[PDB]
């Protein structure tokens, strides 16, 4: 399954925070600066 | 080199999203790990826009730089002062100037230049309508912002530093912006407008040839903005 | 509830003077741990369907439970949908509400709707979400578009390729799957540069 | 805060008093371990070389590389 | 002190009933095992096999450190954290770093798990302030993720599918796995609603 | 690309690869780095129980500042932008600096050697570990509300008395969150039955009588 | 274990691996206590608390295809999984080889 | 007496008077409609009469006021402070913490002190400052 | 000094040498070129153990613990502030003006 | 073992007689793990005072003198070498870092918290009978509420009083 993915979860959290009525946890901004490791493009 | 060119590119409107996408394409797709020149060329471009998301991106990039074993230098603190000055935040500029001397990194003339520009942008973004509700004149805040930067100008001539053109241009910008804001907010107080205009003419007429400096595009830009705000079309 | 953690005074309670009074069923453990004290917007509950389902535990014992599908949503851009089965009605509503809060999503309400046609399909149900200046949907879909805050939107659902087209979860599942696959204008402009 | 490191040092000794110039916290832990009066929740500094290796690993994760070009 | 409260209520209940019941022992087995130290030790055992001089290992180290601090803070649930951990583990760069550390010979994973126990003591990632060293001893002297050659527990969910295919003999070659309902007599209570797993029998 | 940065990263990677090349008295630059880090660590560290109490108090203060920002955005109806996140992070970091400057005194009293100082420091550590909030914070919230609701003579008196006392920068939402909490009935009952005796019990009995009369 | 007019092997099998036993473990209010209450590391890993399969979430699906479609992936590792890894109980031991001896 | 000042059901004849005074003041501040009257000349004069009647009351002083006509560091500090400092502005403010000026009236004289939720007659808002110690 | 740097509005724009020249201008702030807080602490440590520097036992700056903390930090600095204000007129009257 | 521990204890207090009182160990000399006597200084003593002493017994003696001056001698690294081999952890060509860890883990085992955490572990693994629970009931009833608060200030003192017999 690809619908449960760290990039998909980060995109879901980003568009959840981008409303302005949700408060981001610290791991969202800490994963924007340290993204999850991808298996592609290698 | 591409990020350095996009940091000063004014050909199109999309230079900053192009730089963001190029940095993301370099890190994720190309597999390159960002060094100090990548972080410097990105944070110099992120420090130009006063949007809070881009300032947050610059702060998170500086934090990732200090977390990845790349220590801060004069250029990193200069980029942070540039990012904090465009929103008019003098408190963050003073915290960066104190943290720079905490680590023993000496502050050069450009840091004080962008501190003066931080005072300019803090004079710009005063909520004048809230002071109009409280019946408070913004004149002592303008006098404090002037005397602080003139104390900085007395500091840079006491340390024996070579006087640079952007510092005198920042002082001229400060005095011309104080004159413009005094004409906009307190139009009936003609004596303060006259004092600010006399200080601006003193900086424009005597200070440039005191340090044997030659005027440039920004020096003419600030004075042309001053003369255009006074509706003196022929002199402009 | 916006205060899960903080100073716990002994001489004072944890409740405030000007607090909105709860319902007969609303308990503070409905919102999960990762979403507790995060939502700055009030939500409204809309029930999709109640149904009766025979649940088999043993070959000698069959119970008759109630199965409820609903969706929670606020007009400021955040919404989620859920479904759960339970021996009673209010237990099914509570577990479906915590399932809907577990699977919550959001959009960008800068344009109050999409800016390109999104034709998506699940297994059988084919739903198109196209931009408009009004809201073009039936009432069961217009309520979900109001739950997301999409006032400038249009939605069309074809259920003829499904095995059971009269199932009530298909329409809400299709609308949520189409809105989930919709990209905002800022996201596309950031992806292009 | 915008305090100078001279004023930061003066405020540091003003906040900590005379024990700022005395032994460190881990020297107090070493004295409590040697005298035998050490509580159970305290981590005992039992081996110097391995704790040195531990702290060198944890500080090596932040150690900067040399980017100077001759 | 909720574990001490569970211990003393177990003691008082077992002395009141004059027997060791199943309800009281199930209660104290649930109270003594609600701690999230398992996933934090997973992240720190994965961080131990990395290289403090490599920049890619610094990225993986900061990612797993942020993940462990996010689980310890309670802001991220367990299942999404396991998805993040299995995505960080299955990467070819992490397996390359683990293979380089294996082929070295004087590996630095022991100092890694020791500094991990010290960090879990300092940052308050445990339930008791000195429990991390006993958990370190438990990871070392027993079969666990600390004695695996790559630094994760040896289940097939943390290994790549391209390595899962030629070794194991699963259903059909050339996600959630279920028994297809053509098997009407598989076991006594086995059926299509009973899931199966590739490298373990959880029954 | 065999450049200076890439070769520096390569020699850094091969240095920390095994256990050998990075130990004590082997590389002078890493030894100077760990010497400066241990030099700072010798000055800015606390006792371990002091660090645990500071961690609990810092968690409480961070949660209270985040609750203040939540209350402000809930009352104003505005959105959570990046500027509010920057403001909240700056307030949290300056409150953590203030808590470090506070708990330096408790670490000095716990390591002083006097009996009364160590017992008061152990009382502070035990109060912080159990989750009990500070009475200094209650006094700070109450004097901030009284500074808000006083006239200019009283406002100038409070601002001139407390200009040198290093008070934390407290938002209005923290004072409003403390003030709007309802008071506990059983704690008031315990205080009125401990401070006063049978007269307190008769007063609480007539109070419950008035409660049941208002219920009618 | 008290038999109660049954074989004890089949009684423990019905009390461990039946559908009302695991539903009583998840919490259904079945008739009277079909599952074993107090088990430590002898509890099967299918019915652990930190495992990723919950039958209360699976009762709302009427088909095995819907269970394969909508359910989350299971949690791989737990504390009971760590104890079974330390005990080597993730796979049963191989019995005596019946392939070539006889059928007596 | 001195033993009647501590806690623990001692001094019942005066503790029950103080607890009945604060409740009866709270009941007339909230539930007495006839006290919300604008003042007139009968109130303005007779309160000034009642202001001067209390000011004419002098407190009966005790026998303490009657008088007639290598040193230690603690003994010399008392003699030097009495001669060099006849008026001390720092010590008279320490009296305000002990006496607690306007103890029963500043509960109702403050601005915005009592919330609307505790504005009933069963509510216990006058007992918040009771500390047993 | 930390109350004077908070209201100076030029102390972030001043170096360490300018503030150390302005405040005391003595050997006590002289470092002999890198200036930091820990260099001053390391110098004053050996100045204390020799015993050229005397530091009173206990925190003289008290806040955060008790609701009356400015009083106890005023009572801990009366001697130092009074000697700071009275020792230079003692030197003015000892030079026999 | 009793010969080498009594010989190392004899040299420790003989060094304390000649040193003259206090001996303070700072942070940096703790990290280098240097005590008051060097291995050259102790090995010179054992060759001079003891004539009949072979090579491998003398270097075994200087190993125990260095560890008895710092802490009391704990015989726990010898048992940890048997249950934990070198190649299991990954230290085959580093014998110095292997033995530095074994005494670091060995002295971490002898603490009150490690015996407490092992007892709470075995309590969760169901290794007690009804006899263990009944004596734990007597150990809990003997503690009063004033004695419990003094033990709950530490994180392990209230646990260890119940689990001392266990």
Q: Do chains E and F touch (3 or more CB pairs under 8 A)?
A: yes
Spatial distance between the Cα atoms of G55 and G70, rounded to a whole number of angstroms: 13
- What's the CA gap between C48 and C101, in Å, rounded? 15
Residue in the block written with tokens 């599952």:
G35
Choose among C7, C8, C40: nearest Cβ to F70.
C40
Query: Subunits touching H (CB < 8 Å, at least 3 pairs)?
Result: C, F
CB pairs under 8 A between C and E: 7
Percent helix, strand, coil in chain G, to 5, is 40, 0, 60
Answer yes or no: do F108 and I67 touch at CB < 8 A: no
Residue F51 CB partners (closer than 8 Å, separation 6+): E122, F45
Q: Does F186 touch chain H (CB under 8 A)?
A: no
**Contact state of A37 with E62 under an 8 Å Cβ cutoff:** no
Tell me which residue has tokens 């099914």.
C92
| Whole-angstrom distance, CA of residue C44 vs CA of residue C71 | 9
Contacts of E163 (CB under 8 A, 6+ apart): none
Record: contact C87-G19, CB cut-off 8 A: no
Experimental method: cryo-EM
Dmax of chain H from CA atoms?
71
Q: What are the helix (H) ranges across J50-152? A: 55-70, 77-83, 86-89, 95-109, 112-124, 130-141, 145-152
Interface with F, mutate which of D66, D68, D69, D70 (most F CBs under 10 A): D66
Asked if chain C contacts chain H via 3 or more Cβ pairs within 8 Å, the reply is yes
User: Rounded CA gap, B19 and B44, in Å?
Assistant: 11
Interatomic CA distance for residues D9 and I41, integer angstroms: 6
Residues 69-98 of chain J with CB under 8 A from chain F are: 91, 94, 97
Query: Between chains, do B20 and C192 touch, taking CB under 8 Å as contact?
Result: no
Other CB atoms within a 10 A radius of the CB of residue H96 amount to: 9
The shortest CB-CB distance from F195 to any of H115, H118, H132 is to H132
Contact C155, C175 (CB under 8 A): yes
Whether residue G16 contacts residue G8, with contact meaning beta carbons closer than 8 Å, is answered with: no
Place of tokens 């050069």: B108
- Assess H10–F contact: CB distance below 8 Å, yes or no: yes
Beta bridge partners of C128: C119, C156
Residues in chain B with CB shorter than 8 Å from the CB of A38 are 28
Q: How far is CA E130 from the centre of its chain?
A: 20
Q: Strand, coil or helix: what is D2?
A: coil
Half-sphere exposure of E26 (CA within 13 A, CB side): 12
Cα–Cα nearest to C142, from C102, C171, C181, C110: C171
Q: Give the nearest chain C residue to E75 (CA atoms).
A: C34
Contact list in G for residue C65 (CB cut-off 8 A) is 59
Q: Is C57 helix (H, G, I), strand (E, B) or coil?
A: strand
Within 8 A of B144 by CB-CB distance, chain I residues are: 9
Nearest to G50 by CA among G84, G33, G74, G23: G74
Q: Are J2 and J64 in contact (CB under 8 A)?
A: no
Give the strands of the sheet with C61-73, arranged side by side.
Answer: C44-58, C61-73, C78-86, C104-106
Residue B126, CA distances (Å) to B89, B121, B139 in order: 11, 9, 11
Interface of F with I in 141-170 (CB under 8 A): 161-162, 164-167
Report in angstroms the alpha-carbon separations of G102 from G95, G96, G97, G98, G99: 15, 12, 10, 7, 8
- Residue I83 CA, distance from chain mean position: 13
- Give the best residue of G74, G80, G84, G87 to mutate against chain E (max E CB count within 10 A): G74
Q: What is the DSSP letter of A22?
A: B
The number of beta carbons lying within 10 Å of the beta carbon of residue C39 is 22
If residue F100 lies in a helix (H) or strand (E), which one and from where to where? helix F82-110
Interface check for E22 against chain D (CB to CB < 8 A): the answer is no
Whether the CB of J130 is below 8 Å from some CB of chain E: the reply is yes
- Order of strands across the sheet with C153-158? C118-121, C126-130, C153-158, C135-136
- A27 CA: distance to closest CA in chain B (Å): 13
Contact B225, B124 (CB under 8 A): no
Under a CB-based contact definition with an 8 Å cutoff, are residues F121 and D35 in contact? no
Angle (deg, nearest 10), helices B90-102 and B109-124:
160
Query: Do residues F24 and J29 lie in contact, with contact meaning Cβ atoms separated by under 8 Å?
Result: no
CB F29 within 8 A of CB F11: no
Contacts of H113 in chain C (CB under 8 A): none
Residue whose C-alpha is closest to residue E92's, from B31, F14, D22: B31
Place of tokens 């407008």: B193
Using a threshold of 3 CB pairs under 8 A, tell whether chains F and C touch. Answer: yes
Select from F3, F24, F108 the Cβ nearest to the Cβ of D16.
Answer: F108
Neighbouring chains of G at 3+ CB pairs under 8 Å are A, C, E, J
| Contacting E residues, span 51-80, partner chain D, CB-CB under 8 Å | 52-53, 58, 61
Q: How many residues does this entry show for chain D?
A: 70
Chain A's closest residue to F66, CA to CA, is A23
DSSP string of C62-128, one letter each residue: EEEEEEEEEEEE-TTSEEEEEEEEESSHHHHHHHHHHHHHHTEEE---SSSS-SS-EEEESSS-EEE
Neighbours of chain F (3+ CB pairs under 8 A): A, B, C, D, E, H, I, J
Q: How far apart are CA A28 and CA E75, in angstroms?
A: 10
Mark yes or no for CB contact J97/F19 under 8 Å.
yes
CA angle F174, F184, H32 (to 5 degrees): 100
Residue I12 is nearest to which of B97, B144, B159, comparing CB atoms?
A: B97
Q: Hey, which residues 82-141 in chain C have their CB within 8 Å of chain G?
A: 83-85, 87
Residue linked to tokens 């403050």: H110
Q: How far apart are the first and last CA of chain F?
A: 88
> Do the beta carbons of residue C45 and residue E86 sit within 8 Å?
no
Find the chain I residues whose C-beta atoms sit closer than 8 A to any C-beta of D: 1-2, 5-6, 11-12, 14, 16, 19-20, 23, 29, 35-38, 40-41, 44-45, 48-49, 55-61
What residues of E are in contact with residue F52 (Cβ under 8 Å)? 124, 129
Task: Mark out chain E residues that contact chain A at CB-CB < 8 A.
Answer: 59-60, 62-63, 66-67, 69-70, 73, 75-76, 80, 83-84, 87-88, 90-94, 175
As a whole number of angstroms, the longest Cα–Cα distance in chain B is: 62
How far from B235 is each of B39, B179, B223, B227, B229, CA to CA, in Å? 44, 17, 10, 7, 12
SS (HEC) of chain B: CHHHHHHCCCCCCCHHHHHHHHHHHHHHHCCCCCCHHHHHHHHHHHCCCCCHHHHHHHHHHHHHHHHCCCCCCHHHHHHHHHHHHCCCCHHHHHHHHHHHHHCCCCCCHHHHHHHHHHHHHHHHCCCHHHHHHCCCCCHHHHHHHHHHHHHHHHHHCCCCCCCCHHHHHHHHHHHHHHHHHHHHHCCCCHHHHHHHHHHHHHHHHHHHHHCCCCCCHHHHHHHHHHHHHCCCCCCC
Closest-CA distance, D58 to chain B, in angstroms, reads: 12
Are C181 and C143 spatial neighbours (Cβ–Cβ below 8 Å)? no
Which of E75, E76, E188, E189 has the most C C-beta neighbours within 10 Å, making it the best mutation to test the interface with C?
E75
Taking CB atoms and an 8 Å limit, are C57 and G19 in contact across chains?
Answer: yes
* Residues in contact with G57: Cβ distance below 8 Å, sequence separation at least 6, in sequence order: G71
d(CA C184, CA J31): 57
**Closest alpha carbon within chain E to A27:** E70
D in contact with B (at least 3 C-beta pairs within 8 A): yes
Give the separation between CA F7 and CA J139, rounded to whole angstroms.
Answer: 65
The kind and range of the H/E element at H72 are none
State the DSSP code for F180: T
Terminal Cα-to-Cα distance of chain J (whole angstroms): 29
How close, in Å, is residue F128 to chain E by CA atoms? Answer: 14
Does B159 sit within 8 Å of I15, measured CB to CB? yes
Instruction: List the one residue out of F131, F124, F137 whose CA is nearest residue F49.
Output: F124
Asked if the Cβ–Cβ distance from E74 to C33 is below 8 Å, we say yes
């Amino acid at each position: 399954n690809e619908k449960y993915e760290p990039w998909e979860h980060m995109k879901r959290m980003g568009r959840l925070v981008g409303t302005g009525f949700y408060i981001p946890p610290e791991w969202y901004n800490h994963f924007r600066m340290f993204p999850p490791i991808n298996h592609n493009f290698q | 080199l591409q990020l350095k060119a996009l940091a000063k590119d004014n050909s199109q409107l999309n230079s900053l999203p192009e730089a963001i996408q190029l940095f993301d394409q370099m890190e994720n797709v190309y597999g390159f790990i960002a060094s100090r020149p990548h972080y410097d060329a990105m944070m110099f471009h992120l420090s130009q826009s006063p949007r809070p998301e881009m300032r947050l991106r610059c702060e998170e990039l500086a934090h990732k730089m200090e977390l990845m074993g790349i220590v801060w230098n004069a250029n990193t603190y200069l980029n942070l002062i540039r990012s904090a000055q465009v929103v008019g935040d003098v408190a963050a500029v003073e915290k960066y100037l104190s943290r720079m001397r905490e680590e023993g990194i000496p502050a050069s003339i450009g840091h004080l230049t962008w501190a003066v520009q931080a005072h300019v942008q803090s004079m710009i973004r005063i909520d004048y309508d809230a002071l109009k509700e409280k019946d408070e004149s913004p004149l002592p805040t303008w006098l404090e912002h002037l005397e602080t930067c003139f104390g900085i100008y007395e500091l840079v001539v006491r340390r024996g530093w070579v006087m640079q053109l952007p510092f005198v241009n920042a002082l001229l910008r400060l005095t011309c912006q104080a004159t413009i804001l005094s004409m906009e907010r307190t139009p009936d107080e003609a004596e303060t407008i006259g004092r600010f205009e006399e200080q601006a003419n003193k900086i424009w007429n005597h200070t440039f040839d005191e340090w044997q400096l030659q005027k440039d595009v920004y020096s003419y830009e600030c004075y042309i903005a001053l003369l255009a705000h006074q509706q003196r079309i022929d002199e402009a | 509830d916006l205060y899960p953690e903080g100073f716990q005074w002994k001489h004072k309670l944890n409740t405030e003077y000007n607090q909105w009074r709860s319902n007969t069923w609303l308990t503070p453990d409905l919102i999960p741990k990762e979403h507790r004290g995060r939502f700055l917007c009030n939500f409204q509950l809309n029930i999709v369907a109640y149904d009766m389902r025979v649940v088999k535990f043993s070959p000698k014992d069959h119970r008759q439970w109630i199965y409820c599908v609903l969706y929670v949503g606020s007009g400021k851009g955040i919404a989620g949908w859920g479904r759960a089965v339970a021996p009673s009605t209010q237990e099914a509503k509570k577990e479906a509400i915590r399932e809907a809060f577990s699977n919550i999503i959001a959009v960008d309400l800068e344009q109050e709707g999409p800016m390109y046609p999104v034709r998506v399909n699940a297994d059988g149900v084919r739903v198109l979400l196209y931009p408009a200046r009004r809201i073009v949907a039936n009432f069961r879909v217009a309520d979900i578009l109001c739950a997301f805050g999409f006032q400038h939107a249009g939605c069309r659902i074809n259920l003829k390729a499904t095995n059971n087209p009269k199932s009530p979860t298909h329409t809400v599942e299709g609308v949520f799957e189409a809105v989930k696959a919709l990209r905002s204008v800022s996201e596309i402009a950031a992806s292009r540069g | 805060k915008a305090l100078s490191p001279y004023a930061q040092a003066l405020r540091h000794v003003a906040l900590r008093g005379a024990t700022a110039f005395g032994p460190g916290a881990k020297e107090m832990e070493l004295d409590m371990l040697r005298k035998g009066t050490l509580p159970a929740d305290y981590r005992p500094p039992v081996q110097g070389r391995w704790d040195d290796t531990i702290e060198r690993w944890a500080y090596a994760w932040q150690f900067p590389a040399e980017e100077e070009q001759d | 002190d909720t574990e001490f409260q569970a211990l003393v209520e177990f003691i008082e209940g077992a002395s009141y009933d004059q027997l060791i019941s199943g309800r009281r022992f199930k209660k104290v087995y649930d109270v003594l095992s609600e701690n999230d130290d398992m996933f934090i030790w997973l992240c720190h055992t994965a961080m131990s096999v990395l290289n403090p001089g490599d920049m890619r290992s610094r990225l993986i180290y900061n990612h797993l450190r942020i993940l462990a601090e996010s689980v310890a803070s309670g802001e991220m649930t367990q299942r999404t954290a396991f998805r993040f951990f299995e995505s960080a583990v299955r990467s070819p760069a992490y397996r390359e770093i683990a293979k380089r550390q294996l082929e070295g010979g004087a590996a630095t994973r022991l100092a890694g798990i020791s500094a991990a126990a010290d960090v879990m003591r300092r940052m308050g990632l445990t339930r008791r302030p000195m429990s991390s060293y006993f958990e370190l001893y438990q990871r070392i002297v027993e079969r666990s993720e600390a004695m695996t050659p790559w630094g994760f527990p040896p289940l097939f969910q943390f290994e790549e599918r391209l390595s899962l295919e030629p070794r194991l003999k699963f259903f059909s070659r050339a996600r959630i796995f279920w028994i297809p309902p053509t098997w009407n007599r598989a076991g006594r209570f086995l059926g299509p609603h009973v899931t199966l797993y590739p490298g373990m029998t959880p029954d | 690309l065999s450049s200076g940065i890439n070769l520096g990263r390569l020699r850094l990677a091969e240095q920390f690869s095994s256990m050998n090349g990075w130990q004590s008295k082997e590389d002078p630059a890493f030894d100077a780095y760990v010497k400066e880090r241990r030099r700072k660590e010798n000055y800015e560290a606390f006792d371990q129980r002091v660090e645990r109490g500071y961690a609990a108090a810092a968690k409480l203060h961070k949660a209270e500042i985040q609750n203040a920002v939540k209350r402000r955005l809930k009352s104003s109806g505005a959105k959570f932008t990046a500027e509010t996140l920057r403001e909240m992070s700056s307030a949290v970091t300056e409150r953590l600096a203030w808590l470090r400057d506070v708990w330096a005194q408790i670490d000095a009293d716990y390591r002083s050697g006097d009996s009364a100082r160590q017992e008061t420091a152990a009382q502070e550590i035990s109060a912080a570990l159990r989750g009990e909030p500070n009475d200094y914070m209650r006094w700070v919230y109450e004097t901030k509300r009284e500074l808000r609701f006083a006239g200019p003579v009283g406002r100038r008196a409070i601002q001139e008395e407390l200009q040198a006392a290093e008070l934390p920068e407290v938002l209005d939402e923290e004072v409003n969150r403390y003030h709007d909490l309802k008071l506990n009935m059983m704690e008031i009952e315990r205080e009125v039955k401990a401070k006063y005796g049978v007269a307190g019990q008769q007063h609480w009995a007539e109070l419950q009588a008035a409660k049941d009369e208002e219920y009618i | 274990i008290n038999s109660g007019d049954q074989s004890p092997y089949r009684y423990v099998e019905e009390r461990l691996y039946s559908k009302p036993s695991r539903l009583d473990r998840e919490g259904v209010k079945v008739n009277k206590t079909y599952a074993l209450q107090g088990l430590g590391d002898l509890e099967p890993l299918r019915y652990g608390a930190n495992f990723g399969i919950s039958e209360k979430d699976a009762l709302k699906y009427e088909t095995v295809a819907e269970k394969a479609k909508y359910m989350e992936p299971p949690i791989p590792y737990s504390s009971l999984a760590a104890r079974k890894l330390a005990a080597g109980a993730l796979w049963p031991a191989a019995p005596d080889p019946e392939g070539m001896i006889s059928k007596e | 007496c001195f033993s009647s000042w501590n806690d623990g059901s001692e001094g019942y004849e005066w503790k029950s008077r103080a607890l009945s005074e604060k409740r009866s003041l709270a009941l007339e501040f909230l539930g007495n409609v006839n006290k919300r009257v604008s003042i007139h000349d009968a109130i303005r004069l007779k309160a000034d009469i009642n202001k001067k009647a209390i000011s004419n009351v002098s407190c009966p002083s005790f026998f303490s006021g009657i008088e007639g006509a290598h040193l230690s560091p603690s003994d010399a500090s008392l003699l030097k402070e009495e001669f060099l400092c006849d008026y001390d502005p720092s010590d008279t403010k320490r009296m305000a913490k002990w006496v607690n000026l306007r103890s029963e009236t500043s509960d109702y004289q403050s601005y915005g002190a009592i919330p609307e939720g505790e504005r009933s007659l069963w509510s216990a808002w006058y007992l918040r400052n009771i500390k047993a110690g | 000094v930390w109350q004077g740097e908070a209201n100076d509005k030029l102390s972030p724009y001043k170096s360490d040498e300018e503030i150390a020249l302005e405040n005391d201008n003595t050997f006590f702030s002289s470092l002999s070129t890198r200036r930091s807080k820990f260099d001053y602490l390391e110098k004053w440590r050996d100045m204390y153990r020799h015993g050229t520097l005397e530091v009173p036992e206990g925190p003289t700056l008290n806040f955060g613990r008790t609701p009356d903390d400015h009083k106890e930090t005023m009572a801990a600095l009366v001697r130092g502030w009074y000697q700071r204000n009275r020792k230079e007129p003692a030197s003015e009257e000892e030079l026999k003006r | 073992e009793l010969r080498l521990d009594l010989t190392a204890q004899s040299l420790k207090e003989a060094w304390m007689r000649v040193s003259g009182g206090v001996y303070f160990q700072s942070v940096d000399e703790y990290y280098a793990s240097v005590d008051g006597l060097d291995a050259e200084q102790i090995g010179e003593v054992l060759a001079a005072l003891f004539p009949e002493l072979n090579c491998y017994e003398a270097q075994a003696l200087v190993q125990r003198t260095l560890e008895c001056i710092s802490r009391p001698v704990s015989a726990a690294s010898r048992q940890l070498s048997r249950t934990i081999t070198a190649e299991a952890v990954g230290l085959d060509n580093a014998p110095g870092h292997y033995t530095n860890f074994l005494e670091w883990m060995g002295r971490l085992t002898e603490t009150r918290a490690f015996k407490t955490e092992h007892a709470l572990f075995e309590f969760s693994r169901r290794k007690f009978n009804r006899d263990d629970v009944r004596v734990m009931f007597e150990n809990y009833r003997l503690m009063s509420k004033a004695t419990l608060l003094a033990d709950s200030a530490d994180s392990y003192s209230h646990f260890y009083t119940v689990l001392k017999d266990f």
